[PDB]
Amino acid sequence: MKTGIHPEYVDTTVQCGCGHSFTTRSTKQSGTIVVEVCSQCHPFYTGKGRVARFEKRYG
Amino acid sequence: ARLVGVDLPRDKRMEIALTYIYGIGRTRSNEILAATGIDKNMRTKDLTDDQVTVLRDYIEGNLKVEGDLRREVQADIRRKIEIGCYQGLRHRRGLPVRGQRTKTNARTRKGPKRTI
Amino acid sequence: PRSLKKGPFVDDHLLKKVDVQNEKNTKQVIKTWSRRSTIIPDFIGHTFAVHDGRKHVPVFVTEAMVGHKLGEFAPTRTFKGH
Amino acid sequence: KALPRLKQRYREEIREALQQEFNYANVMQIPGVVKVVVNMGVGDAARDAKLINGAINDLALITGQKPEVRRARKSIAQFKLREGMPIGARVTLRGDRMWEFLDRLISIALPRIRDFRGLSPKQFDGTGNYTFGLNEQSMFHEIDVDSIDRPRGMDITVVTTATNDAEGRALLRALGFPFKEN
RNA sequence: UUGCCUCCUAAAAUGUAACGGAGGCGCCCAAAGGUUCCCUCAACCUGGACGGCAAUCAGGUGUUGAGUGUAAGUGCACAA
RNA sequence: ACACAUGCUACAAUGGCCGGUACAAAGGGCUGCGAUGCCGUGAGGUGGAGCGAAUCCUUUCAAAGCCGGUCUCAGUUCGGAUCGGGGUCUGCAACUCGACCCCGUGAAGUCGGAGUCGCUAGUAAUCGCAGAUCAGCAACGCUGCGGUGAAUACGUUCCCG
Ligand SMILES: [Mg+2]
Ligand SMILES: [Mg+2]
Ligand SMILES: [Mg+2]
Ligand SMILES: [Mg+2]
Ligand SMILES: [Mg+2]
Ligand SMILES: [Mg+2]
Ligand SMILES: [Mg+2]
Ligand SMILES: [Mg+2]
Ligand SMILES: [Mg+2]
Ligand SMILES: [Mg+2]
Ligand SMILES: [Mg+2]
Ligand SMILES: [Mg+2]
Ligand SMILES: [Mg+2]
Ligand SMILES: [Mg+2]
Ligand SMILES: [Mg+2]
Ligand SMILES: [Mg+2]
Ligand SMILES: [Mg+2]
Ligand SMILES: [Mg+2]
Ligand SMILES: [Mg+2]
Ligand SMILES: [Mg+2]
Ligand SMILES: [Mg+2]
Ligand SMILES: [Mg+2]
Ligand SMILES: [Mg+2]
Ligand SMILES: [Zn+2]
């Protein structure tokens, strides 16, 4: 790990609107990331005809 | 801010800001911001994460926007292009579909003027 | 669009023809000069010869084609370019 | 006296999961993941040397280690390119940092993709290594929207000890990767 | 055309003519020199956001077909 | 694939959008004009008061205007073409080919080369209204009606008749 050349790697805590917390390493110097969507939030992770269109109108 | 995959502009009154979402325009803005209870006269600077949550929840709930909307409209055009309908033949040719006048104008369909 | 209050328009002529066709279960090619009747689910599998003014064009109705007037699938004027 | 979460979740669960599924003779033949390479091909660095300096800050912010610039090893006419012009940047991720990046990518970045319908399971090549592209660096959170000159794409590849595509697919599946089904 | 360099002619040492057959040179490099240490190509196959036969990334096959400042030969993967 | 010609809407801040408020003239009406009320978001639907009309309906009729708020010079809260969905009405029938409404979409366009046109006062410029034809309308046309309202004319050398 060549000494000076890298950006600093802080400890970090990730917080979400659904309450999920994460303790990770990050490049953010604050050390805290509040984020809206995650692996728990997202509708893809959670799983979320012309004749019918005809009979709806007239039937 | 960040909403439904979009990036809301720096300073706009919220009813104008929401219009950068591909499924929404000024009327749907005066609906959404009335239903959520968020003042339309706010900036994008004074928006909070909570307000963004209520917004995203509402407009994902009752409205189709952005990528799914585009996929769907494109899907309608290719739907009528496949069945060999008249409008489909028009979309193929690159001409006006609505029964308008093709003898002179229609340049917005045809594109820039190519001389003979 | 025709208003929903009136219901979709099919002339009694080919209404009767397609009924007689699908009650005997035979699928024939029906010769119709009516461009103006909308397509109904009753028509879904049949085949029509429709008038483009010069001739009759073969039209095989499918599911995707419901809710459309007949004439749309027989083009009128011929343009091959310059 | 420390631990990344994905390294942990791998060592405790996934290992046994695969050992029940594929019934390996030896505990060694269990596929683990070797390295994660991130690469941004520029290509307009042929015309403008300034863009590379944008790519550098991108990768270095996203990953957390300074990128390694690549020279063009051939000289090509049509792309307006000679030998020795810096074309593209590459970062190799191993051990801890590899794990932590994998986790930020799985848990955060990929859910933030615009119209994310998932990843294709078909991107494995013959050996069970997995490469997928990305269109815009805006997805990551250590990168600021405010400061971007222009959206730039990057390739992420996860190269694994897996022998085939079945094993690798199972490993990434177990690992929380969002694959479509076909 | 006339000096110098390489091949062939040239008859398995060396040498060998013709207005015989092919090419080059009248420089370049302050590193493209010295040394210590490390590495292996070209091509082909599969997979990757622009990106295509061919740019950069990953994996596989590959004993030498690449590459050697500059012609050609004799060499060089043990690496020149 | 094109070229010409007359028009309309524009390219924005003397402006756009929301709210409040003031002033016309002329016209049109029988199987026609159709009100209050009710249902719609809105085209409109239900309904029929009252009128062959200085009376009733077209609202007491306008819009630009005035007061206020917001937008802050940007391809934008400019521009509305195009295209998708969803409707209403006319009509035996809106596919080729009607108008209108609603949601979304949001292109060219930054005052326009050579040239060229109109206009001498209630004129130009700009703002709405009505009518004829007509079941419906391609009406931005045409014929009228009024609102607000300029600049300049030294002068006959030159172009046109
Ligand atoms: Mg492997
Ligand atoms: Mg010899
Ligand atoms: Mg010899
Ligand atoms: Mg000899
Ligand atoms: Mg001799
Ligand atoms: Mg010579
Ligand atoms: Mg050296
Ligand atoms: Mg390789
Ligand atoms: Mg002409
Ligand atoms: Mg006009
Ligand atoms: Mg106007
Ligand atoms: Mg306007
Ligand atoms: Mg507007
Ligand atoms: Mg007003
Ligand atoms: Mg008068
Ligand atoms: Mg109402
Ligand atoms: Mg009133
Ligand atoms: Mg606009
Ligand atoms: Mg433009
Ligand atoms: Mg401007
Ligand atoms: Mg000019
Ligand atoms: Mg006069
Ligand atoms: Mg009329
Ligand atoms: Zn979450």
Side-chain angles (χ1 to χ4, degrees), chain B residues 51-97:
Chain B
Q51 314 183 6
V52 173
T53 312
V54 198
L55 243 40
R56 101 183 186 163
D57 287 332
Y58 179 94
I59 95 175
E60 90 188 1
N62 328 334
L63 240 48
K64 54 183 165 194
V65 312
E66 286 299 335
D68 250 18
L69 219 214
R70 309 175 182 281
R71 289 193 178 285
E72 184 225 35
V73 161
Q74 164 208 22
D76 290 317
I77 309 167
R78 80 204 172 187
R79 190 225 103 214
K80 71 189 53 179
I81 222 170
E82 281 167 22
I83 79 176
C85 159
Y86 175 78
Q87 297 187 355
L89 317 179
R90 292 310 220 155
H91 280 281
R92 286 176 176 175
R93 301 278 183 181
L95 296 169
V97 184

Short mmCIF file of all heavy atoms in Angstrom, two decimals, chain B residues 51-97:
data_model
loop_
_atom_site.label_atom_id
_atom_site.label_comp_id
_atom_site.label_asym_id
_atom_site.label_seq_id
_atom_site.Cartn_x
_atom_site.Cartn_y
_atom_site.Cartn_z
N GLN B 51 -39.71 14.71 2.92
CA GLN B 51 -40.59 15.22 1.87
C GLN B 51 -40.38 14.47 0.55
O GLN B 51 -41.35 14.11 -0.14
CB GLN B 51 -40.36 16.71 1.69
CG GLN B 51 -40.29 17.47 3.01
CD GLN B 51 -40.14 18.96 2.81
OE1 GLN B 51 -40.19 19.45 1.68
NE2 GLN B 51 -39.94 19.69 3.90
N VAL B 52 -39.11 14.23 0.21
CA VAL B 52 -38.74 13.42 -0.96
C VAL B 52 -39.31 12.00 -0.82
O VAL B 52 -39.74 11.40 -1.82
CB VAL B 52 -37.18 13.36 -1.14
CG1 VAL B 52 -36.78 12.38 -2.24
CG2 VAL B 52 -36.62 14.74 -1.46
N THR B 53 -39.33 11.47 0.40
CA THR B 53 -39.92 10.15 0.64
C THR B 53 -41.43 10.14 0.37
O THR B 53 -41.94 9.25 -0.32
CB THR B 53 -39.67 9.64 2.08
OG1 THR B 53 -38.28 9.80 2.42
CG2 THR B 53 -40.06 8.16 2.20
N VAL B 54 -42.15 11.12 0.93
CA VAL B 54 -43.60 11.18 0.74
C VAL B 54 -43.94 11.33 -0.75
O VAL B 54 -44.84 10.66 -1.27
CB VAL B 54 -44.24 12.34 1.51
CG1 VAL B 54 -45.74 12.10 1.66
CG2 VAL B 54 -43.59 12.48 2.88
N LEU B 55 -43.20 12.22 -1.41
CA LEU B 55 -43.32 12.42 -2.85
C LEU B 55 -43.11 11.12 -3.64
O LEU B 55 -44.00 10.69 -4.37
CB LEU B 55 -42.31 13.48 -3.32
CG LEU B 55 -42.85 14.78 -3.94
CD1 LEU B 55 -44.08 15.29 -3.20
CD2 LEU B 55 -41.78 15.87 -3.97
N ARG B 56 -41.95 10.48 -3.46
CA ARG B 56 -41.63 9.25 -4.19
C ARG B 56 -42.70 8.18 -3.96
O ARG B 56 -43.08 7.48 -4.91
CB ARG B 56 -40.25 8.73 -3.79
CG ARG B 56 -40.21 7.58 -2.79
CD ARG B 56 -38.78 7.24 -2.45
NE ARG B 56 -38.70 6.05 -1.61
CZ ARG B 56 -37.59 5.35 -1.43
NH1 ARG B 56 -36.46 5.70 -2.04
NH2 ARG B 56 -37.62 4.27 -0.64
N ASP B 57 -43.20 8.08 -2.73
CA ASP B 57 -44.20 7.07 -2.38
C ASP B 57 -45.51 7.34 -3.11
O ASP B 57 -46.09 6.43 -3.73
CB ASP B 57 -44.43 7.05 -0.86
CG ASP B 57 -43.27 6.41 -0.09
OD1 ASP B 57 -42.56 5.56 -0.67
OD2 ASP B 57 -43.08 6.77 1.10
N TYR B 58 -45.96 8.59 -3.05
CA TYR B 58 -47.18 8.97 -3.74
C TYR B 58 -47.09 8.71 -5.25
O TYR B 58 -47.90 7.96 -5.81
CB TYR B 58 -47.51 10.45 -3.48
CG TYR B 58 -48.76 10.93 -4.19
CD1 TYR B 58 -49.99 10.93 -3.53
CD2 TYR B 58 -48.72 11.39 -5.50
CE1 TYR B 58 -51.15 11.37 -4.17
CE2 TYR B 58 -49.87 11.82 -6.15
CZ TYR B 58 -51.08 11.81 -5.48
OH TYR B 58 -52.22 12.25 -6.12
N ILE B 59 -46.10 9.32 -5.89
CA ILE B 59 -46.08 9.34 -7.36
C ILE B 59 -45.61 8.02 -7.95
O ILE B 59 -45.82 7.76 -9.13
CB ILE B 59 -45.20 10.50 -7.92
CG1 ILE B 59 -43.78 10.04 -8.25
CG2 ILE B 59 -45.20 11.70 -6.97
CD1 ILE B 59 -42.95 11.13 -8.91
N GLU B 60 -44.99 7.16 -7.13
CA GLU B 60 -44.78 5.78 -7.56
C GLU B 60 -46.09 5.01 -7.38
O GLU B 60 -46.37 4.06 -8.12
CB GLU B 60 -43.63 5.11 -6.80
CG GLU B 60 -44.04 4.39 -5.51
CD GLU B 60 -42.84 3.92 -4.70
OE1 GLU B 60 -41.69 4.17 -5.12
OE2 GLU B 60 -43.06 3.31 -3.63
N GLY B 61 -46.89 5.43 -6.39
CA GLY B 61 -48.16 4.77 -6.14
C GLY B 61 -49.20 4.95 -7.24
O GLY B 61 -49.69 3.97 -7.80
N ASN B 62 -49.54 6.20 -7.55
CA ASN B 62 -50.66 6.49 -8.46
C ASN B 62 -50.31 6.85 -9.91
O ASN B 62 -51.20 7.09 -10.73
CB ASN B 62 -51.51 7.61 -7.87
CG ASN B 62 -51.53 7.58 -6.35
OD1 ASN B 62 -51.34 6.53 -5.73
ND2 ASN B 62 -51.74 8.75 -5.74
N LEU B 63 -49.02 6.89 -10.23
CA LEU B 63 -48.56 7.45 -11.51
C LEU B 63 -47.42 6.65 -12.12
O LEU B 63 -46.52 6.21 -11.41
CB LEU B 63 -48.12 8.90 -11.31
CG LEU B 63 -48.83 10.00 -12.08
CD1 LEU B 63 -50.33 9.85 -11.98
CD2 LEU B 63 -48.39 11.36 -11.56
N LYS B 64 -47.45 6.45 -13.44
CA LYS B 64 -46.30 5.84 -14.11
C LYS B 64 -45.46 6.92 -14.78
O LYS B 64 -45.97 7.76 -15.53
CB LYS B 64 -46.74 4.79 -15.13
CG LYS B 64 -47.74 5.26 -16.16
CD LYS B 64 -48.14 4.10 -17.05
CE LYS B 64 -49.39 4.43 -17.85
NZ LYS B 64 -50.00 3.22 -18.48
N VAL B 65 -44.17 6.91 -14.47
CA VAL B 65 -43.25 7.93 -14.94
C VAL B 65 -41.97 7.31 -15.49
O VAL B 65 -41.68 6.13 -15.27
CB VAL B 65 -42.87 8.93 -13.83
CG1 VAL B 65 -44.12 9.42 -13.08
CG2 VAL B 65 -41.87 8.30 -12.87
N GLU B 66 -41.21 8.12 -16.23
CA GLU B 66 -39.87 7.78 -16.67
C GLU B 66 -39.74 6.49 -17.48
O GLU B 66 -40.52 6.23 -18.40
CB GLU B 66 -38.93 7.71 -15.45
CG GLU B 66 -38.57 9.08 -14.87
CD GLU B 66 -37.83 9.97 -15.88
OE1 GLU B 66 -37.18 9.43 -16.81
OE2 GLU B 66 -37.90 11.21 -15.74
N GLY B 67 -38.72 5.70 -17.14
CA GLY B 67 -38.31 4.56 -17.93
C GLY B 67 -39.42 3.60 -18.32
O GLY B 67 -39.51 3.18 -19.48
N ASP B 68 -40.29 3.28 -17.37
CA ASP B 68 -41.40 2.38 -17.65
C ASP B 68 -42.37 3.03 -18.63
O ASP B 68 -42.91 2.37 -19.53
CB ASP B 68 -42.11 1.98 -16.36
CG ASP B 68 -41.87 0.51 -16.01
OD1 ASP B 68 -40.91 -0.08 -16.56
OD2 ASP B 68 -42.64 -0.05 -15.20
N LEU B 69 -42.58 4.34 -18.47
CA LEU B 69 -43.46 5.07 -19.37
C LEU B 69 -42.90 5.06 -20.80
O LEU B 69 -43.64 4.78 -21.74
CB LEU B 69 -43.64 6.51 -18.88
CG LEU B 69 -45.01 7.17 -19.00
CD1 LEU B 69 -44.83 8.66 -19.28
CD2 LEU B 69 -45.90 6.52 -20.05
N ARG B 70 -41.62 5.38 -20.95
CA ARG B 70 -40.99 5.37 -22.27
C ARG B 70 -41.08 4.00 -22.92
O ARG B 70 -41.46 3.88 -24.10
CB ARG B 70 -39.52 5.79 -22.18
CG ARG B 70 -39.26 7.08 -21.43
CD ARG B 70 -37.75 7.32 -21.31
NE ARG B 70 -37.43 8.52 -20.55
CZ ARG B 70 -37.48 9.76 -21.05
NH1 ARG B 70 -37.87 9.95 -22.31
NH2 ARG B 70 -37.16 10.79 -20.28
N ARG B 71 -40.72 2.96 -22.15
CA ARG B 71 -40.80 1.57 -22.63
C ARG B 71 -42.21 1.28 -23.12
O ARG B 71 -42.41 0.61 -24.13
CB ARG B 71 -40.40 0.58 -21.52
CG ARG B 71 -38.90 0.57 -21.18
CD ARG B 71 -38.49 -0.64 -20.33
NE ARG B 71 -37.05 -0.66 -20.07
CZ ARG B 71 -36.11 -0.98 -20.97
NH1 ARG B 71 -36.46 -1.32 -22.21
NH2 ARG B 71 -34.83 -0.97 -20.63
N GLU B 72 -43.19 1.83 -22.41
CA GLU B 72 -44.59 1.57 -22.71
C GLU B 72 -45.10 2.29 -23.97
O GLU B 72 -45.84 1.71 -24.76
CB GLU B 72 -45.44 1.96 -21.51
CG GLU B 72 -46.89 1.64 -21.67
CD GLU B 72 -47.75 2.79 -21.22
OE1 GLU B 72 -47.32 3.95 -21.42
OE2 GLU B 72 -48.84 2.53 -20.67
N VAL B 73 -44.69 3.54 -24.14
CA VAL B 73 -45.08 4.31 -25.32
C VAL B 73 -44.42 3.75 -26.58
O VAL B 73 -45.09 3.51 -27.60
CB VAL B 73 -44.72 5.80 -25.15
CG1 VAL B 73 -44.68 6.50 -26.51
CG2 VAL B 73 -45.70 6.48 -24.19
N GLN B 74 -43.11 3.54 -26.50
CA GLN B 74 -42.38 2.84 -27.54
C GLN B 74 -43.08 1.51 -27.88
O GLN B 74 -43.21 1.14 -29.06
CB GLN B 74 -40.94 2.60 -27.10
CG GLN B 74 -40.18 1.57 -27.92
CD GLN B 74 -39.09 0.87 -27.11
OE1 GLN B 74 -39.13 0.84 -25.88
NE2 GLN B 74 -38.11 0.30 -27.81
N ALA B 75 -43.55 0.81 -26.84
CA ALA B 75 -44.27 -0.46 -27.00
C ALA B 75 -45.60 -0.30 -27.74
O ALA B 75 -46.02 -1.20 -28.48
CB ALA B 75 -44.51 -1.12 -25.64
N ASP B 76 -46.27 0.83 -27.54
CA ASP B 76 -47.52 1.09 -28.25
C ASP B 76 -47.26 1.36 -29.73
O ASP B 76 -47.95 0.82 -30.61
CB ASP B 76 -48.28 2.26 -27.61
CG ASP B 76 -48.84 1.91 -26.24
OD1 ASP B 76 -49.39 0.80 -26.09
OD2 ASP B 76 -48.74 2.74 -25.30
N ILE B 77 -46.26 2.19 -30.00
CA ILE B 77 -45.92 2.49 -31.39
C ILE B 77 -45.53 1.22 -32.14
O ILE B 77 -46.06 0.97 -33.22
CB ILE B 77 -44.78 3.53 -31.50
CG1 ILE B 77 -45.09 4.76 -30.63
CG2 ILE B 77 -44.58 3.95 -32.96
CD1 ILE B 77 -43.93 5.70 -30.42
N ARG B 78 -44.64 0.39 -31.57
CA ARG B 78 -44.21 -0.85 -32.25
C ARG B 78 -45.36 -1.87 -32.29
O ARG B 78 -45.41 -2.72 -33.21
CB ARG B 78 -42.96 -1.44 -31.60
CG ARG B 78 -43.19 -2.24 -30.33
CD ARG B 78 -41.94 -2.28 -29.45
NE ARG B 78 -42.20 -2.87 -28.13
CZ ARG B 78 -41.32 -2.91 -27.13
NH1 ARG B 78 -40.11 -2.38 -27.27
NH2 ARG B 78 -41.67 -3.47 -25.98
N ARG B 79 -46.31 -1.73 -31.36
CA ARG B 79 -47.52 -2.54 -31.38
C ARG B 79 -48.38 -2.26 -32.62
O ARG B 79 -48.85 -3.19 -33.28
CB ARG B 79 -48.37 -2.27 -30.12
CG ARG B 79 -49.53 -3.25 -29.92
CD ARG B 79 -50.79 -2.52 -29.55
NE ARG B 79 -51.71 -2.40 -30.68
CZ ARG B 79 -52.50 -1.35 -30.90
NH1 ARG B 79 -52.47 -0.31 -30.07
NH2 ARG B 79 -53.31 -1.33 -31.95
N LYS B 80 -48.58 -0.98 -32.93
CA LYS B 80 -49.39 -0.65 -34.10
C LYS B 80 -48.57 -0.69 -35.39
O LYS B 80 -49.14 -0.68 -36.49
CB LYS B 80 -50.04 0.73 -33.95
CG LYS B 80 -49.09 1.90 -34.04
CD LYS B 80 -49.81 3.19 -33.66
CE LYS B 80 -50.49 3.05 -32.29
NZ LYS B 80 -51.19 4.30 -31.89
N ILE B 81 -47.25 -0.73 -35.27
CA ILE B 81 -46.39 -0.87 -36.44
C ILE B 81 -46.35 -2.34 -36.88
O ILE B 81 -46.18 -2.63 -38.07
CB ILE B 81 -44.93 -0.36 -36.16
CG1 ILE B 81 -44.38 0.45 -37.34
CG2 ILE B 81 -43.98 -1.50 -35.79
CD1 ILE B 81 -43.08 1.18 -37.03
N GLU B 82 -46.53 -3.25 -35.93
CA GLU B 82 -46.46 -4.67 -36.24
C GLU B 82 -47.73 -5.19 -36.92
O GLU B 82 -47.65 -5.99 -37.85
CB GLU B 82 -46.17 -5.49 -34.97
CG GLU B 82 -44.69 -5.47 -34.54
CD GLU B 82 -44.48 -6.00 -33.12
OE1 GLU B 82 -45.34 -6.76 -32.62
OE2 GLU B 82 -43.44 -5.65 -32.50
N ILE B 83 -48.89 -4.74 -36.46
CA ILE B 83 -50.15 -5.28 -36.97
C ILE B 83 -50.46 -4.78 -38.38
O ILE B 83 -51.45 -5.20 -38.99
CB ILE B 83 -51.35 -4.96 -36.04
CG1 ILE B 83 -51.84 -3.53 -36.23
CG2 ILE B 83 -51.01 -5.26 -34.59
CD1 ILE B 83 -53.07 -3.21 -35.40
N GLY B 84 -49.62 -3.88 -38.90
CA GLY B 84 -49.74 -3.43 -40.28
C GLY B 84 -50.90 -2.47 -40.47
O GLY B 84 -51.44 -2.34 -41.57
N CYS B 85 -51.27 -1.81 -39.38
CA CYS B 85 -52.28 -0.75 -39.39
C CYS B 85 -51.78 0.44 -40.21
O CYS B 85 -50.58 0.61 -40.39
CB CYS B 85 -52.61 -0.35 -37.95
SG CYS B 85 -53.37 1.27 -37.75
N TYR B 86 -52.71 1.26 -40.70
CA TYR B 86 -52.38 2.45 -41.49
C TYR B 86 -51.36 3.36 -40.78
O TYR B 86 -50.33 3.74 -41.36
CB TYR B 86 -53.65 3.24 -41.79
CG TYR B 86 -53.39 4.55 -42.48
CD1 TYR B 86 -53.11 4.59 -43.85
CD2 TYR B 86 -53.41 5.75 -41.78
CE1 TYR B 86 -52.86 5.79 -44.50
CE2 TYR B 86 -53.16 6.96 -42.42
CZ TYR B 86 -52.89 6.98 -43.78
OH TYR B 86 -52.63 8.17 -44.43
N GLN B 87 -51.68 3.71 -39.54
CA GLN B 87 -50.80 4.51 -38.69
C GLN B 87 -49.40 3.90 -38.61
O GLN B 87 -48.40 4.62 -38.54
CB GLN B 87 -51.37 4.64 -37.28
CG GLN B 87 -52.69 5.37 -37.18
CD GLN B 87 -53.08 5.60 -35.74
OE1 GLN B 87 -52.41 5.13 -34.82
NE2 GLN B 87 -54.17 6.33 -35.53
N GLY B 88 -49.36 2.57 -38.60
CA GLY B 88 -48.10 1.85 -38.60
C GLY B 88 -47.29 2.09 -39.87
O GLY B 88 -46.08 2.28 -39.80
N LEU B 89 -47.97 2.08 -41.02
CA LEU B 89 -47.31 2.33 -42.30
C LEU B 89 -46.76 3.75 -42.31
O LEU B 89 -45.67 4.00 -42.83
CB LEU B 89 -48.27 2.12 -43.47
CG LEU B 89 -49.17 0.89 -43.38
CD1 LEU B 89 -50.12 0.79 -44.59
CD2 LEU B 89 -48.34 -0.39 -43.21
N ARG B 90 -47.51 4.67 -41.71
CA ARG B 90 -47.04 6.04 -41.56
C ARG B 90 -45.78 6.13 -40.69
O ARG B 90 -44.80 6.78 -41.09
CB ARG B 90 -48.15 6.92 -40.97
CG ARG B 90 -49.32 7.12 -41.91
CD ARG B 90 -48.85 7.56 -43.27
NE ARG B 90 -49.72 8.57 -43.83
CZ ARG B 90 -49.34 9.46 -44.74
NH1 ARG B 90 -48.09 9.44 -45.19
NH2 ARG B 90 -50.20 10.36 -45.20
N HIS B 91 -45.79 5.50 -39.51
CA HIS B 91 -44.61 5.45 -38.64
C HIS B 91 -43.40 4.84 -39.34
O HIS B 91 -42.27 5.28 -39.13
CB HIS B 91 -44.91 4.66 -37.37
CG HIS B 91 -45.64 5.42 -36.33
ND1 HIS B 91 -45.02 6.33 -35.49
CD2 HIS B 91 -46.94 5.40 -35.95
CE1 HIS B 91 -45.91 6.84 -34.66
NE2 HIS B 91 -47.09 6.29 -34.92
N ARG B 92 -43.63 3.82 -40.17
CA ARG B 92 -42.58 3.23 -40.99
C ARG B 92 -41.98 4.25 -41.96
O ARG B 92 -40.77 4.46 -42.00
CB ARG B 92 -43.11 2.03 -41.79
CG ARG B 92 -43.35 0.76 -40.98
CD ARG B 92 -43.97 -0.32 -41.87
NE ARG B 92 -44.13 -1.59 -41.17
CZ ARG B 92 -44.73 -2.66 -41.70
NH1 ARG B 92 -45.22 -2.61 -42.93
NH2 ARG B 92 -44.83 -3.78 -40.99
N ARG B 93 -42.85 4.88 -42.76
CA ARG B 93 -42.43 5.85 -43.78
C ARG B 93 -41.71 7.07 -43.19
O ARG B 93 -40.85 7.66 -43.84
CB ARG B 93 -43.63 6.34 -44.61
CG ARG B 93 -44.40 5.26 -45.34
CD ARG B 93 -43.75 4.86 -46.66
NE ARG B 93 -44.55 3.87 -47.38
CZ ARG B 93 -44.21 3.33 -48.55
NH1 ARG B 93 -43.08 3.68 -49.16
NH2 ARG B 93 -45.01 2.43 -49.12
N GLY B 94 -42.04 7.42 -41.95
CA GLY B 94 -41.56 8.65 -41.36
C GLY B 94 -42.36 9.86 -41.83
O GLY B 94 -41.80 10.92 -42.12
N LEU B 95 -43.68 9.69 -41.89
CA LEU B 95 -44.61 10.76 -42.31
C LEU B 95 -45.62 11.11 -41.21
O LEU B 95 -45.68 10.44 -40.18
CB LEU B 95 -45.33 10.31 -43.59
CG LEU B 95 -44.41 10.11 -44.79
CD1 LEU B 95 -45.14 9.42 -45.94
CD2 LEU B 95 -43.80 11.43 -45.24
N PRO B 96 -46.44 12.16 -41.43
CA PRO B 96 -47.47 12.49 -40.44
C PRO B 96 -48.61 11.47 -40.33
O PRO B 96 -49.21 11.06 -41.32
CB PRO B 96 -48.01 13.85 -40.92
CG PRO B 96 -47.52 14.00 -42.33
CD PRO B 96 -46.22 13.26 -42.38
N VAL B 97 -48.90 11.08 -39.09
CA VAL B 97 -49.85 10.02 -38.81
C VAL B 97 -51.32 10.45 -38.63
O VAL B 97 -52.23 9.65 -38.84
CB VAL B 97 -49.39 9.27 -37.54
CG1 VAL B 97 -50.28 8.07 -37.24
CG2 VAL B 97 -47.94 8.81 -37.70
#
